[model samples]
Target: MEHVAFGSEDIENTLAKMDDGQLDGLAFGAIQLDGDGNILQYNAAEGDITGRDPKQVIGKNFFKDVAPCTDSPEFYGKFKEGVASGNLNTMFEYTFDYQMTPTKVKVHMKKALSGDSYWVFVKRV
Candidate 1:
């Protein structure tokens, strides 16, 4: 009943309470990052989907180190805007062309309540 659906509303609040183990149980890829775009938590599903190992990616700068392809407006633009404006519930489709084959995925960005942390939820199409 409390499953963390990929499209659930108010999902930001739900994910804030989840531990690393629970986050790994998610069917979709979920990346928890600091406001500066540093990788804080890279879930299991995300690693499996993107073929990026969490051990190597965690602590890396997501916008620069991991996925620079998303440095443009379509992806990174929304992240900065939402953080500055205090609302980060955004969804869009983007293609990944960094390191791996071109893969399209639905991206959902959410802002946490307290810290300057953000959540990037991805679902393969």
Candidate 2:
């Protein structure tokens, strides 16, 4: 497993071969979620950036339970579109909710080739 560069076109595939431990070494935040939005892998870097309890969030819903602020036309809506189309390779700049420190980040969302998991990549701006 390897740490993929943020915004790399092949991030989804690289992450697919990685495990939770390997993910923790990433320079950018790395999160893997199921199609249902359940958090599958929450890396240490992401936990620090989001001020979230990474150890406690696995198996929980990311969009609704953890970061509901993302449940909007720009964020979650894009996820829905990706899921429906089976091609989730997308990247954009965004500001997280104020409650989460109003962090400005570059986000990349992609799905594994197997189609079971989606990966959310984050880079602080």
Candidate 3:
């Protein structure tokens, strides 16, 4: 194994230093988005899991377009709160209901310490 455990401090540190291309190699679904939920990095794992092409997902609004199931107060609201307060690091189990079947997943949303970017880590539960 590559030691890429989702929600681990090691994974967070590694992701902070990695670019969009580097993120694609991760074993789990990793989506890097801006403060406004604009998709910046959509990895292969994410594409495969959601059954969407990376080309179509990139540059799209994650909360609205890519993952509409998370547009609610619980998921998207948390991200908005994090950006406004300049702090966000949370993990919870969620059921995604878009594109394919309703998939159960562990979701982790973390904001960069010095920037407006956030990394969303997802793994099958």
Candidate 4:
């Protein structure tokens, strides 16, 4: 496993750096989701990983613009349930056929807070 040095910042900063190469693509994007699921952060490294600029994505709906595959009510419902239930480590593997070669990606999501608001950290493997 690669070690990521989360710098001395608030959890938000550490999370942003994780997506800003603090972990060199190992830990990317410390994202905050609104009640409507819009993205609040698409840090530098996350832009690099997803081929989308932070400016273009930060305010967009992540499930719509980037990973629409996760946009179903069930998906969001499950995520909400996990946060409510304190199941912090939620993950799954998915294939993005829209990519040039159908890239296989794994997403690991965890909650650092509770309620309708939450922070998520993601990486691609």
- CA lDDT, every model vs. true structure: 0.87, 0.83, 0.84, 0.55
lDDT of 4 at 102: 54
Candidate 4 lDDT, 1-125, residue by residue in tens:
23443321244334444433443344454566665668765565445555666677767776677666566654666676765676545556655443435555555565544445555555567
Q: What's each prediction's TM-score?
A: 0.93, 0.91, 0.91, 0.61
Q: Return the number of clashes found in candidate 2.
A: 0
Which whole-number lDDT from 0 to 100 does residue 100 have in model 4? Answer: 38
Candidate 1, residues 1-125: lDDT per residue as tens digits? 23778978878778778888888888899999888899999999899878998879999999988999999988998898987887789888999988899999999898876668889999999
* Candidate 2 lDDT tens digits, 1-125: 35467777766667666778889888899888888899988999888888898989998898888888788899899998888887788888888773667888888888876657788888898
Give the candidate number with the greatest TM-score.
1
| TM-score, candidate number 4 | 0.61
Candidate numbers sorted by lDDT from highest down: 1, 3, 2, 4
Pairs that collide in candidate 4 are 19-29
Rate residue 7 of model 4 by lDDT: 27
Which window of ten consecutive residues has the lowest lDDT sum in model 1?
1-10
Candidate 3, poorest ten consecutive residues by summed lDDT: 1-10
What digit string (tens of lDDT, one per residue) describes model 3 on residues 32-63?
88998999888888887778888788899998
Q: In model 2, what are the clashing residue pairs, if there are any? A: none
The Cα RMSD of model 3 versus the native structure comes to: 1.6
CA displacement after TM-score superposition, residue 82 of candidate 4 (Å): 2.9
Ranking of candidates on TM-score, top first: 1, 2, 3, 4
